[PDB]
């Protein structure tokens, strides 16, 4: 019962945009592992980032 790549997609599938700060705390999982997972899917094309601070959401 520790987080999985598919659990992150499913998380962003509902709340859309989301700080990793939130993802780490809401998924009951260390931050730098969530940070590495996002960075993976993003290059895999599954997620993407937003700035102005970081925000992750779905798709190409």
């Amino acid at each position: 019962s520790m987080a999985s790549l598919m659990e992150v997609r499913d998380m962003l599938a509902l709340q859309g945009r989301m700080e990793a700060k939130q993802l780490s705390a809401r998924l009951q999982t260390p931050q730098p592992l969530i940070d590495a997972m996002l960075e993976r899917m993003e290059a895999m094309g599954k997620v993407v980032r937003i700035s102005e601070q970081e925000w992750w959401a779905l798709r190409l």
């Binding site: 598919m6 997609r9 730098p32 993976r40 899917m41 895999m44």
Partner: protein
């Protein structure tokens, strides 16, 4: 006694400045196999071999989705050029650095882990870490220039990586990836083909091509998953990040 070592690792991890202290004075340069980027070869000597060290591009993985680097390294690894490799691994970002590490060890090619920059860190349980990967791990504090000598010595002895269940995948993926392997030519060592079958499922493009007459069966395999698996590209990279977390918990 001549030896060739591939120096692969993440970007922003002193791969650059480790390559320096190994070679130091002797560093020639060239354009890479038919393109515009920099092949940085260097020579240094142990008290057994004259090592031809081959600096690779910085890369976070071997999954080639253009973003060459992955392919440039994925090529040189599969080319059978390197006698063995050195995976440079920063300890601060382990969860990041270790994706490349797990792929390199699944590919079986002899590897030695240079643990990086460890004044940037506190301290970790190294002996269990190396035995969880099945290879040797030399930790370093490079600004002293100490531990490099242990790494020079580690290239001399290491023969082959230990045979371990590095990543536990769901059997559905293995099943279909094994079949993509049998369609390939036996020119490739059977251990590698199992790997190339999984990279093809992940969405690798250089593997789609390297495997060749087999990529025609890729889409008909991916269809046989869609039934059971929602997205195979993820479960592959997931099961990797599972054992990534399993390791990083067991040492920190």
């Amino acid at each position: 006694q001549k030896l060739t070592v591939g120096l692969i690792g993440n970007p922003n991890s002193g791969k650059t400045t480790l390559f320096n202290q190994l070679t130091g004075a002797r560093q020639r340069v060239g354009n890479w196999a038919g393109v515009t980027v920099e092949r940085k070869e260097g020579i240094f000597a142990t008290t057994d071999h004259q090592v031809t060290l081959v600096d690779l591009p910085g890369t976070y993985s071997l999954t080639t989705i253009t973003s060459l680097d992955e392919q440039i390294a994925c090529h040189y690894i599969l080319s059978g050029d390197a006698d063995m490799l050195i995976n440079v691994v920063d300890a601060s970002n382990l969860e990041r650095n270790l994706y490349l590490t797990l792929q390199l060890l699944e590919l079986g090619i002899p590897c030695v882990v240079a643990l990086n920059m460890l004044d940037i860190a506190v301290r970790i349980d190294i002996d269990a870490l190396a035995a969880r990967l099945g290879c040797p791990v030399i930790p370093l504090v490079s600004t002293r220039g100490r531990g490099i000598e242990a790494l020079k010595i580690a290239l001399d002895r290491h023969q082959a990586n230990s045979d371990l269940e590095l990543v536990h995948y769901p059997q559905p993926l293995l099943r279909e990836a094994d079949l993509l392997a049998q369609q390939m030519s036996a020119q490739i060592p059977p251990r590698q083909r199992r790997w190339l079958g999984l990279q093809m499922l992940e969405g690798d493009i250089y593997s789609r091509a390297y495997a060749g007459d087999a990529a025609d069966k890729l889409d008909i395999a991916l269809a046989n998953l869609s039934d059971e698996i929602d997205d195979p590209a993820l479960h592959i990279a997931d099961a990797r990040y599972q054992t990534i977390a399993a390791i990083c918990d067991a040492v920190s």
